[PDB]
Structure formats: structure tokens, C-alpha cells
Amino acid sequence: AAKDVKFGNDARVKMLRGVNVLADAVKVTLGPKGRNVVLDKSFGAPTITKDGVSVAREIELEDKFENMGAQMVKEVASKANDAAGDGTTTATVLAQAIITEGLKAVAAGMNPMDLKRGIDKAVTAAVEELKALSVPCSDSKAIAQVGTISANSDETVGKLIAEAMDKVGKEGVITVEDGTGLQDELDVVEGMQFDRGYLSPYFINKPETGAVELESPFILLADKKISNIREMLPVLEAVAKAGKPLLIIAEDVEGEALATLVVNTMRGIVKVAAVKAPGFGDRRKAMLQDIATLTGGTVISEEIGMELEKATLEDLGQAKRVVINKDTTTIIDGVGEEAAIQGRVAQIRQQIEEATSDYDREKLQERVAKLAGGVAVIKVGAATEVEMKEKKARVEDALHATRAAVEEGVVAGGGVALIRVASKLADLRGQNEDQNVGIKVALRAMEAPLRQIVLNCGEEPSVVANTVKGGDGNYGYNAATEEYGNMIDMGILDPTKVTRSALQYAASVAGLMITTECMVTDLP
Amino acid sequence: AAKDVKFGNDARVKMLRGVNVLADAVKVTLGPKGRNVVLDKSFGAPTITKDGVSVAREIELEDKFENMGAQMVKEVASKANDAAGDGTTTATVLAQAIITEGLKAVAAGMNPMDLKRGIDKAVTAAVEELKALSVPCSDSKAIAQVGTISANSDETVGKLIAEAMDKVGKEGVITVEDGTGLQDELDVVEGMQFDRGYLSPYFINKPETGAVELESPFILLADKKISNIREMLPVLEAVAKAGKPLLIIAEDVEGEALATLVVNTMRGIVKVAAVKAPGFGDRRKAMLQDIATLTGGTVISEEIGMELEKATLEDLGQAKRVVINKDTTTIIDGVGEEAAIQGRVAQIRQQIEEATSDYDREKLQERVAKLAGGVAVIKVGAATEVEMKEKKARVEDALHATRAAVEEGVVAGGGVALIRVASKLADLRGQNEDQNVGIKVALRAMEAPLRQIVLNCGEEPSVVANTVKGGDGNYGYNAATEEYGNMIDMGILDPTKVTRSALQYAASVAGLMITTECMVTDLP
Amino acid sequence: AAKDVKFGNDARVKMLRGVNVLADAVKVTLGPKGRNVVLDKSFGAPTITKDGVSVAREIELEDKFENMGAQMVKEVASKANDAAGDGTTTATVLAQAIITEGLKAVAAGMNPMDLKRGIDKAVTAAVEELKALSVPCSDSKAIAQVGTISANSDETVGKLIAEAMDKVGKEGVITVEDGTGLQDELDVVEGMQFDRGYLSPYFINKPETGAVELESPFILLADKKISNIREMLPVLEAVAKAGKPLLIIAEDVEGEALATLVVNTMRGIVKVAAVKAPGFGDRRKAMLQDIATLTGGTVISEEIGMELEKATLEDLGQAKRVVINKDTTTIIDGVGEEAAIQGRVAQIRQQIEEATSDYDREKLQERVAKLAGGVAVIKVGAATEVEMKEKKARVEDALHATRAAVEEGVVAGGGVALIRVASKLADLRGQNEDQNVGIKVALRAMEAPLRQIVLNCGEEPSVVANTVKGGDGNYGYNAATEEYGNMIDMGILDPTKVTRSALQYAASVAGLMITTECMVTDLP
Numbered sequence A, B, C: 001a002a003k004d005v006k007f008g009n010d011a012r013v014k015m016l017r018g019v020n021v022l023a024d025a026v027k028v029t030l031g032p033k034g035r036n037v038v039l040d041k042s043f044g045a046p047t048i049t050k051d052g053v054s055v056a057r058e059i060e061l062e063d064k065f066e067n068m069g070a071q072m073v074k075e076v077a078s079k080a081n082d083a084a085g086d087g088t089t090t091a092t093v094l095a096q097a098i099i100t101e102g103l104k105a106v107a108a109g110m111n112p113m114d115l116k117r118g119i120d121k122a123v124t125a126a127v128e129e130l131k132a133l134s135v136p137c138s139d140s141k142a143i144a145q146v147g148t149i150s151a152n153s154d155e156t157v158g159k160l161i162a163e164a165m166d167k168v169g170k171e172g173v174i175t176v177e178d179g180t181g182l183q184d185e186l187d188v189v190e191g192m193q194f195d196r197g198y199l200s201p202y203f204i205n206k207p208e209t210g211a212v213e214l215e216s217p218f219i220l221l222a223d224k225k226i227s228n229i230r231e232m233l234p235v236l237e238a239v240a241k242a243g244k245p246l247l248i249i250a251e252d253v254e255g256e257a258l259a260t261l262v263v264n265t266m267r268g269i270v271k272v273a274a275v276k277a278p279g280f281g282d283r284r285k286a287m288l289q290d291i292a293t294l295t296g297g298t299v300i301s302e303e304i305g306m307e308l309e310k311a312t313l314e315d316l317g318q319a320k321r322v323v324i325n326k327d328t329t330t331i332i333d334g335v336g337e338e339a340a341i342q343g344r345v346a347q348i349r350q351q352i353e354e355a356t357s358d359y360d361r362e363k364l365q366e367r368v369a370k371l372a373g374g375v376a377v378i379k380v381g382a383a384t385e386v387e388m389k390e391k392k393a394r395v396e397d398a399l400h401a402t403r404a405a406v407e408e409g410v411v412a413g414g415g416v417a418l419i420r421v422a423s424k425l426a427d428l429r430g431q432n433e434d435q436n437v438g439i440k441v442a443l444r445a446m447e448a449p450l451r452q453i454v455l456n457c458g459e460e461p462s463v464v465a466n467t468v469k470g471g472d473g474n475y476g477y478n479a480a481t482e483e484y485g486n487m488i489d490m491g492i493l494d495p496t497k498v499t500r501s502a503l504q505y506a507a508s509v510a511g512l513m514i515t516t517e518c519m520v521t522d523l524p
């Protein structure tokens, strides 16, 4: 593959022109008065989005060098979304700022490797100062606040997350799905519930709605699919002699085994229900042990020294009540030690830290929430499918933000935190004169986010930056109300993590990026 | 791959140009004096249609940006059809008006997101105002009127649909099909009728055309296929001893059981006929118990404590008569008390509301109707294929509209409803001056539909709009007579559902669309 | 993909230019002095044809808009052929005349949708005037005349068709095949005849050419091949005492069974012949019960309760005489008389009508004719193959025409019919002025066909039209002799069906076509 090489200011400029494109395209979505971008998709109708990394991911340039530039800054936006879920635009805006003033500094002839050392040092300091400005976010008031801001001033969304986090606890999981009507809807499930139906419609008890109810039943668990015919008599015969109902959770139940269970329950011999296991293998098998230890039963596996025909009443689990409908199965207050239950959650703590990243965290906490806490699901409503993609995207941002705000705390929004930490670091110096510039470049660049928000309002950024920098603490500019005031009192909150993350990531890549003396790529 | 990005008014102009194409092609079909669009098809001859959403779907533009714009408003036309089934054109016109006046406001430098907030609130208000103006549609005259209007002034369509709804009621199902002769025809099937043929042609009785008539028959139902063993004998011997012709409803009957069945009917000991069960596997089993309880029979299931070999003369139901032909099977009378049937009809009511939308509702309402009410079918009498395609489309259009008008009520036609609610919302204000403009852009755009129906007459739209705004109530312009009057007395009717829908949908995408500061797409 | 849209007079013209091409290529074949069009075929040599729809189907234009136009009018020509089989050209000229004057009326700004209503009212009115002017076609003189006219003044074709219709009855089928000798040949078969040969040639009786004559034979029907078990013979032992000649029609006859049949016939105990059944199962089996009841025999089926060895002498049918050859087998008179036969004829009546249309009715009427009436075949002949294809098309045209002329009656040819009803509709008016013009446009267009015929003679159409419009009754212009006179007495007759159809179909597409305000297609 024949390559093409460029040097010096020639190459830097080509790179910069590319970066500016990715950045200038992301910038328009910043802040409450920030605007929307349309991304063309071959697949279906276009996508309208205010989410920065969403726009960033789609940017690709024809000039190989400009492309390289943009493709490099596209990473700072992406790394933010995989970490925080908010601040992608903020992080991207910071990244651009560092590089512009940075590359300008190289044109001054200053040594770049020294410039990076200065920046990284200034950045390290700024993070510490942020750890200082960080105040804990606890009350559902603050939760609604960080949520409302990250949602672009949707108070319903903010209020919705605070309720969800409040009802199911901090361990409760929350998911975002497409809506039916035009209204947002909050669903809450307490206790253990998974999605599967009764295998035969004939299992319905007295209650209508297709509800099957079992009071103080026996639960049975199989690692394998049942099928055959009758199978398992000793366990069923023991439950019949016992005087209680049985619940069966297996890989599946084939028609022969189902029929014989149906005939016995129809005639009235023994009250019985049988339901399919939660998921495909290892999803299912893992969630039996979650389910097994909750109800104090023992999982019967073909992979160990036990089998279905040999079973004891002790292998069975017990619960107060169980409810099964066409799509759902529920276990009301099953009986297992709090010791054993907390044992399974503690084992998932080791499961919390993984290499799987996203979707690993969604399905892992899902098991945990079901075992201890409860689940919350938010249904986003819309008139049309394109508004749905916008509403749900604003909801996902707000969800990650509130979660992040909860754990790592909050600082004043409006990017005023960065502009404040920059004011605190003013007396900072480096090893050499060149390193000093790298430090100063960073502080000037921490102004960028605030100065960008104002510009999106079409107002003089120069004036607002001045009038905010003249003051101290949480005094800041409200872009929505277009008036100054206390950021914290006005409910404008940045999860500290998203602000910290945006700053760190942009500096890392931009620091490396201004060190470029050459660029190699494939020929057109 | 490599993309192309444009910003601001540069991009908006490109977007609008596209929108206008999609719209301008659709606009021409609006109103009674509106005209037809031709859509070329590679397979066969081209199609001539006045139906708006049909035209919108076919629009695709060469300029990548212009295309993106059009593809977005193409959605408002499509969502309209998916909701109401009428008002695709009107909704398209509204969007353009919103986008046109909307983008104009952004060019002024007003904040788009405030424009959107200003619009949706005005829209929300209009929805309430329309929902208030909606009046019940009951009398068959009114039904005939809205049907005729959606049919573009075809009285036969109005009078024909009104009769069908009048004969089988609100709940009767109506379907629309292609036809042989030139006159519209309405066929109605009473009692229980499902579509399947006799497996053996020798079952034919006196009546030609393959007619098989059976007096006081028996109904038998198999969850399973009855091909191989043909062991029902003991049940048959009981019925042969009774000397009655029965009806056999199974998954299917193979020639082995049939051949001996043929010979049995040939010899004369007992006349017997057998036809296939109505539906697909899970679907049919739901419709099997429905047929059994109608005739008072009991369903034979392999999933229950019964079996194919075990049945009694008592498990079969009785009917007055049954008629089986090449295509359809019929039971003219079943034997049962009104308590159990109306209960099962009441029980199917809960199955009626589901997620399954289309194809679910047709046969379900079909089943409910077959069990209690009746089914109605309308055959469209167009002469040729190019004339048939437009004719049938107007008939389906009118059907959804009558359906829509009945359930949610009707409002004054001629698009006069929107202009009327616009006058009622006149004092509506927003949070700031920009939001105020958003509201006015909405109200200003609500005149669009009427002035467009006028403009298609080649008459001054401004004058008619003014003189209509001069009046109140149902006062409006009649485009067919080209003179004014009362819209309701003149039988010009807008289903409240479609007008409300058309408004909401246009508002959704148009509101979102004017928020565009950038557009990203592929390179030519 | 990317589309292209044009509006208004811009698009209409493109549509028009297209229509004009399709028409102008068809026009030249109109009338006795009409000329021929050559259609190129890639595979073989070109085809020369006077058949109108033949030329129309081949037309495809490069400009997508013009193409759309022609492809739409290509349909009026196609529907004429699909209905009558004649009148295809006449219909096309009608369509062109209507469309041209219509667009002229639209360019005046008159409402198109009102124009369509005007025309159709005019068209519907004209049909009744035709139905009044329709006089019955009965005598073989008149039938020969309309056949001759549709044949382009070929008297042989008319008299030959007239001979066919008189001899074999109304139920007879008529076919057109390629010729051996330069001469046209009419072959007629009375009674029951099907095509299959004797499997063994040794069966020949007195008459040579392998002709077998069997007196009072016996009919047998088999769903099975007589291969495996040929020991079915005992029925023959009953036949050996009774008579020589029995005929067996089965799925097939194997060599071992044939061999034993040959030798037994060789000695002289009983002279016997055996032949295979004529057709495919579904069709042959349908024609099997036909032969059994014709001769008063009973069908033996393996799919029913009968067998190979089990037969009764009553199960066989009898005939006056039977003759069998290498190709065909024949039954002269049957013994089931009219009682069994017409019962089968009346039950097959419902099968005569269907949705299968062509291909099904071809051979179904074949079956019906064989049972009561007889089948007729016309051998069309020519010197060369290209002259044969034009010849066969005119024979098919004349064939379709006589069939159509018989059922719906005839009116004066030369298009004098249309121009005569046009004089009658002069006082017809619509609801508004635009509708009036549409009515006049139709009447103006009904003159087109006649003036076009004259134009093909290279004479002034205006002169003949006027001097023709001056007279009454059947007075018209004779294009062959170039002199005036009585159309019916001069033997120039139009089947009422073809003239009725041409107008209706031409009006259907032309009416819809002048409503076009827009056209969408793919980019070049």
C-alpha cells in the first residue's frame, strides 16, 4: 500500500482543519440553547440528535490527513460516552481548544514535548481542585436537578429519575424503552420478577386475567429441559403427599410432561405450575442459582452427581406466594437466609468489575436488583419515531448523569466549574518556559465550554467570561434564563464525574496530538 | 465513508428545498378540485393515484441534502396513514407551512428550541380545542357523509359504507376487494362462516357448484392432525347409530380416513362430511374452542385428559344445518344457551386490546363478529387496473375515515376546524418572545389546509380565508360548489381523529426539523 | 432510487408525446386500406402484423415521462384484446382523441376532475344508445359477414368460420393452427373424441391404417397403472361369454399385460383393444366420470372403495361404435342418453364460469363440447411463416369477433355506429359547464375512428365525416369500394361488444389520464 508523507506546519494545518470539522459539527449541540444535528442514514429516515458522540461517530473526511485529524479527536468524544454518558460535547469542545492554542504555540517554535508535560501537569492539578469543589449529591432534589439539566431542561425526566432512584434504591436498575402514547411512563416492580409465561394456558387458577396463583408452593429447578413423560415422580409424589403446590422452573417442558401435569391438575390431584427458564444458556443457568439461593432450594443439574429422578424435598425451594401470567412469572417473598442471599450479591461484586463494559453492567445489576432491590423502567413517549430517538437519547444522557452525579458528586454547571478551577491554578508554573505555556493553554481552554454555551445563545462570549471570572465560587451564567445567578440555587448541576472525565480525556489526546511532526497515510 | 457536512442557513436552504419537493408533489391532490399524481412502476403499467401518503413514499432526491429533508417529512405523511388512514395530504401541507414559517424565524436569529416549545404548546392547545369540538357520529346519514367526503365526493361509497356499518353495526368487520363488473357491490355473510374447502369432492349433495348440505350435524375438534389411524370409530359408531350427518373439524384429513369416509357416504349407512380447521396452529387452537362452544361441542385435545380414540356421542355439538363448498364452510345455526356464548364473546373482549396492531385485529374482530355479529365485504367495481387501483384506494380511505369518525367523532370539514381553533387560541402566549413566535407560526400554519383547497380551485386563497375568519362556527367554503355556507349542513365532514392526528404529527417533525444547525451525509 | 418530478402543462405534454407515439404506430393498421407495421424480434426473423394490440405491447420509449404516458394507454389496447380480441385498434384511436381534446381543455384551465365526470356520463349514455341500435346476429350469412370484416375483407375466413359455427354447435371450440397446404382447411369432429393411441399396434381390425372397429364396446376407468397386477382378468371372463370388443382406458398398460392381451386377441376367442387415457390426472379424472356416465358405466377408483379384480359388467359403459388409432380414439353414441349426460352438463355449468379465465375454459369447454356437441378445428395456412403469423392473427381476430358478434349483436360498421350515437347525445348536459365540455369532447372523439379509416385511404376525413353525418340509419362510407351505401346491407358489421368495449376501455384510461398534474420517475 503506497503511502504519502507530510511534514511540519504543512501537516499540522491539514490535521487541524480536520479536527475543526469534527469539533465545529459537535459544538452546535452544546448547552440548553444548543441546536440539533441531522445524521443521514442509508438504512431509513435520517436521525436528529443533540448527543455529541452520536454526531462525532458519524464524521469522516475525504482528505486523508484531515480525516486522520478528525478521527483522532473523534476518540475523546467516544471515550467520554463509554465512561460518563454525558459531557461528550463538553469534552470535544475542550479538546479542540487545547489543540488550536497548542498548535499555534508550536508555530511559535516552542518545544511540543514540553507543552504536553505542562498541560498534563496543569490538568492533574485541575482534577484535584475539582475534587475540592465537588459537593455530595444526595437528596432527590439534587437528583432531579442533574437529571433535568442533562435532559436539556426536561423537568419531567429529571423528576422521573429521582423517583425511580428513590423507589428501587440506589441498587435498583433503570432501563429506557420506546413508548406507546405521547406520555412518559414509570413502571416499578418490587421483589423477584422475570419475563416468561406459563407453558400451558390451562394452569390458570380462580383469578381471571389469566393469573395463576400459588400460596406457599414448592419451587423446582432444572439445568436441563424436562420432556420425556412424567419424569420426576418422587418429587411430585412427595409434594402431593405433602399437601402443597409445586412450581417448576426448567430449561423447558415438552408436551408429554406438560400434558401429564395438565391432566393431574385438571382432575384436581395436585395444584401445579411449570414455567420456562429465564434465558439462553449461562443467562438461564446463572439466574437459577440467583433464584435457587433466594428460595433456599437446590438447583438440580445433569452436570453434577445428581439427577431428576433422585431428588429430595430439601432440593426444593419454598416461597410465600407465586404469580404467573401469560408473559410473566413472579415470586412474592421467597424464603432463603439473608446470609446466603447477601453471599450471592457479594460474589457479583467481583462480577461488577469486568472487561465486558457496557451491557455487562446492564444485565449484571439486573440479576442483583431482582434479588435484593427492585427494578424501574422508563417508557419514553413520542408522536413519531424520529422524536422517539430524540426523547430516549435525552433520557439516556440524564440517566447516566444522575447515576454519575450520585456516586462522584456534583459541581456548578455552565462549565463554571472548569472556569473556576482555572482561576485557582493561576499561580502554577512548570520546569521550563515552554512548559509554562502548556499550563496556560489549558486554563484558557477551560474557559471554552462556558464561552461556547453563550455563543450558542448568540451573545458576546467575551463579556460573559469576564463578568463571571470577575466573581468567585458558584456565581455563573444561566443560558436558558439569560441572566446571572447562583448555579447551585438555580438547579444547574454538572455531575463532577462527567466534567472531570471530559477534561481528562481531551487533554490526553490533545496533548499527544500537538506533538505531531509527521503524518503517514495511504494514497488516494 | 467520507461525509459532507454543511452548517446553518446553508444547510437549512438545502433541507427546505427537499421538503418543498416532497410537499409540492403531494399538495396537488388536496381537496375535491385537487388533481392526480402518476407514479411510475418498472414491473407493470404506472399507477394513477390521488392518495397523498402514496406519493410521499415515492419521493427521493438526487441532491444528498435535499433528499434528507424530504425523507424526514416523508415520515409525517406515513405516520398519518398508520394512525387515521386519512389526512395524509393535509398533514403534509401543515408540516411544510410550519417548516417554511419556522425556518424563516431561525433566519431572523430566533432560538429554534424555543420555537419548538412554542409550537408544541400551541399544538397541545389545539388538540384540546379539537377534542372539545368533536361531536358524536351516529346516524347513517352522517356516516354516509364522511365516507363520501373521504371518497372525494363519491356518494355510492358513502351510501355503501354507511349501509355496511348499518347492517353489521359498529363491530362488524368490513373488507375491500377488487371486483369484476362496473358497479359497487356489498356482500354480507350471516352466522358462523370460515374459509376452508371439503377435502373430498364426493361429499356433494343435490346442489351443484359443489354444495354439501347437512341437517342437524355434529362438531368435532382435534388439536391434532387426524390423517393416519382414523380410530374415531367408536365415536362414529355412536353417531352412525344415531343416523345423523356430522361435521369434522381437524388440522387436516388425509385420503385414508377420507377414502373409507367416501365409501361410507357412498354406501349410505350415514352421510358424513369433513372440512379443515380454520387457522394457523396457535391461531386456530384459539378459534377451535370458539367453534365448539358455539355448537355446544367439546374440543378434543392431546394436551388434555382426552384423546383421539376416546370420545362420546355427547362430546359433539349440534347445528341446524351446515353448508360446505369449494371455498368456504358454514354453520347457519348452533345449539347453545345465550349465557355461555355471550360470556365467551365477553371473554374475547380482553384479548381485543393488544400490542399486535394490524392483522391481529382483523381476524379477532372477525371471530368476535362471526360468533355474535356478522361480516361485511365490499367489492369495488372499477373497469381497468389503472382505474381499479385509484378506486380501491378511495374506498379504503373512506372506510378508515368512517371508522375514525365514528369512534372519535367528527368536526367541520374544509380544514375549517384548524382555522377555527386557531382563532380560539389567539391569546395564547409562551415564556419568551421567541416562544411567542413559535405559537404564531403554528396558528399561521393552520390556515394552510383551507387556503390550499382554495388554491387548487385556482381561486384567491387569501380572500376565502379572510371571509371565513370573518365568521364563526361551522361557516366555511365549499370547494365543489365554489360558494360559501355551513359545512355541517352541507355534509362536509372531518373525522376529529384524522385532523387531530394530522396536526400533531406535522408539528412533531416540523418542530424538530427547524432545530437543524448542521447536516451530515455521504459524498456523491 | 433518486426520482424526478415534473408538474402541470410541462409534464402533461411529455405524457402526451408518449401517447401519440403508441397511438400513431397503431393507427396505420386501422381499416381495409390500413397498412402494416413491422416488429423486430431479437431471436428470429421480424414479424409483420396488422393486429393493433400486437403493435401496442411492443412500444417502450426512452424518455421516462413519455414512456409512462404510452405505458398507460398501452393498457386500453390491451384491455380491448383481453375482452374482445378485436377492436384493439379502434379503442386506441378513441383513447387518443379523448386525451388530446381533454388536455386542450385543461390548458384552458377547466377543472379536469369535472371533465372526467362529464365524459363518463357521456360514455355511459352512449352505451345504451348502442344497446338500442344493437340488432341480433343470427343467419349464417351475417355471421360470415362480421367474420369477414374482422378478417380484413377475407371472404374465405368468414365463410369458413360461419361453416364451423353452424356445424358443430355453440358449444364447439374453435382453434387456429399453422397450415400445411397453401389452403385454409376446416375439420369437424362429432361426438366424443380424445387424443391417445393404442400401446400395442397389433390391435388393428378390418379397416386399414391401423383402424380398429369394435361393435358395442365396454368402458373402464383406472386411477392406476395395470402394470403390477394384470390378473384383474376375471371381469373379462364374464366378457368372454358375452362379446368380443371391450375397451380399457387406464393410467397405462404394461408390456406383460399388453402381451397377454395381444395373444388372446390373436386366437379369436375375443377381439380386444386397450388404450391409454388422454390427459393429466386432474383434467383426465374429471373427463373420466364424463365418459363413464356418457356410456352409462361406473368409474373405478383406487382412491375409493373399489379394486382391480372387483368389477361388475354393469360398471362398463356401452357405445354405438368405437374406433381407435395411433393418435385418437372415438366414441360415436353412448347409452347413458340425455339423463346422465345433461346432469353432468348442468353440474359442469358452474365450472364453465370461474376466475381461471383463459387456459382453464380452453379445455373445460373442450370437455363440455365433447359430451353433447362436437369440437371444430380450423387449419390456418400460408406460403411462408411470416405470412402465417399475420394470417393466424386475423383468423383469431375474426374468430373472437364472430363469437362476440353473436352474443351481444351487431351495429353498422365503419365506426358509423359511434358517430351515430354521438348525434343522439347532442342534447346531453352535465352539472356544470366544465362537465359539458367533457361530454362534447367525448362526442367529438367518437368521430375519430371513422375519419381515421378514411385518412388511411389518403382521403379528406372531413368530407366523408360530414356527408356521413348528414344521413340516417346505417348510412356510411365504404372504404374498400370507396363509395357510400348501407353498412348492414353491404355486409360490413361490427360486433356490438367490440365497439362497446373499445369506447369504455378507452374512456377509462383516457378519463383518468387527463387528470394528471404531476409525474414521478427514476433519473436517467
Ligand SMILES: Nc1ncnc2c1ncn2[C@@H]1O[C@H](COP(=O)(O)OP(=O)(O)O)[C@@H](O)[C@H]1O
Pocket (backbone or CB within 6 Å): A029, A030, A031, A032, A034, A052, A086, A087, A088, A089, A090, A091, A149, A150, A152, A153, A412, A413, A414, A415, A416, A453, A477, A478, A479, A480, A481, A492, A493, A494
Ligand atoms: N439552563 C442552563 N444554563 C446554563 N448552562 C447550562 C444550562 N443547561 C445546561 N447547561 C450547561 O451546558 C452543558 C450541557 O451539556 P450537553 O450539551 O447537554 O451535553 P455535554 O455535557 O456532552 O456537552 C453542561 O455543562 C451545563 O453546565
Ligand SMILES: Nc1ncnc2c1ncn2[C@@H]1O[C@H](COP(=O)(O)OP(=O)(O)O)[C@@H](O)[C@H]1O
Pocket (backbone or CB within 6 Å): B029, B030, B031, B032, B034, B050, B051, B052, B086, B087, B088, B089, B090, B149, B150, B152, B397, B412, B413, B414, B415, B416, B453, B477, B478, B479, B480, B481, B492, B493, B494, B495
Ligand atoms: N367539497 C369540499 N369542499 C371543501 N372542503 C372539502 C370538500 N371535500 C373535502 N374537503 C376537506 O378536504 C379534506 C379532503 O382531502 P382530500 O383532497 O380528499 O385528501 P385525501 O384524499 O388525502 O384525504 C377533507 O378532510 C375535508 O375536510
Ligand SMILES: Nc1ncnc2c1ncn2[C@@H]1O[C@H](COP(=O)(O)OP(=O)(O)O)[C@@H](O)[C@H]1O
Pocket (backbone or CB within 6 Å): C029, C030, C031, C032, C034, C052, C086, C087, C088, C089, C090, C091, C149, C150, C152, C153, C412, C413, C414, C415, C453, C477, C478, C479, C480, C481, C492, C493, C494
Ligand atoms: N370496407 C370497409 N368500409 C368501411 N369500414 C370498414 C371496412 N372494412 C373494415 N372497416 C372498419 O374497420 C374496423 C376494423 O379495423 P381493424 O383495424 O381490422 O380492427 P380494429 O381497428 O378493431 O383493431 C371496423 O370498425 C370496421 O367498421
Ligand code: BEF
Pocket (backbone or CB within 6 Å): A029, A050, A051, A052, A053, A085, A086, A087, A088, A089, A090, A397
Ligand atoms: F453531548 Be452530551 F449530552 F455528553
Ligand code: BEF
Pocket (backbone or CB within 6 Å): B030, B031, B052, B085, B086, B087, B088, B089, B090, B091, B092
Ligand atoms: F390529508 Be388527506 F385529505 F388524506
Ligand code: BEF
Pocket (backbone or CB within 6 Å): C050, C051, C052, C053, C085, C086, C087, C088, C089, C090, C150, C394, C397
Ligand atoms: F384489432 Be383488429 F384486427 F379488429
Ligand SMILES: [K+]
Pocket (backbone or CB within 6 Å): A029, A030, A031, A050, A051, A052, A089
Ligand atoms: K449535547
Ligand SMILES: [K+]
Pocket (backbone or CB within 6 Å): B029, B030, B031, B050, B051, B052, B089
Ligand atoms: K389526497
Ligand SMILES: [K+]
Pocket (backbone or CB within 6 Å): C029, C030, C050, C051, C052, C089
Ligand atoms: K387492427
Ligand SMILES: [Mg+2]
Pocket (backbone or CB within 6 Å): A086, A087, A149, A150, A151, A397
Ligand atoms: Mg449533556
Ligand SMILES: [Mg+2]
Pocket (backbone or CB within 6 Å): B086, B087, B149, B150, B151, B152, B397
Ligand atoms: Mg380523504
Ligand SMILES: [Mg+2]
Pocket (backbone or CB within 6 Å): C086, C087, C149, C150, C151, C152, C397
Ligand atoms: Mg378487425
